[PDB]
RNA sequence: CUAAGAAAUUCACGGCGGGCUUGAUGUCCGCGUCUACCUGGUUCACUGCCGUGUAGGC
């Protein structure tokens, strides 16, 4: 649980986004760790196979 | 002010081997097609006393 600077070393994705009367935000986004991937794969492989038979 | 802004894929190859499709068959019967018309508004034609001489002759 410790963090350091915040910063975006060059490659990391920044957009301008409009705001409603003027300016703009930079908007750094993040890749998340939301995982799909568990339910996709559980969905694919675990009982996919039992309902795929039936 | 665009998940922004950048990016050389690069190369080669043996698909080969062989072969019985066979036989048989009933298309089979009919039929009312009628009726009336102007090719005519066009053939710039053989000559010749003729002038071949762009008007000139039956």
């Known amino acids: 649980t410790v963090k350091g600077a915040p910063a975006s070393h060059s490659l ?7 705001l ?7 908007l750094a986004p993040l890749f ?3 995982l ?8 694919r492989e675990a009982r996919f ?3 795929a038979k039936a």
């Open 12 to 18: 990391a994705k920044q957009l301008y986004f409009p």
């Open 49 to 51: 196979g039992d309902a």
């Open 36 to 43: 799909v991937h568990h339910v996709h794969a559980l969905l």
């Open 20 to 26: 409603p009367g003027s300016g703009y935000h930079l």
């Open 32 to 34: 998340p760790t939301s």
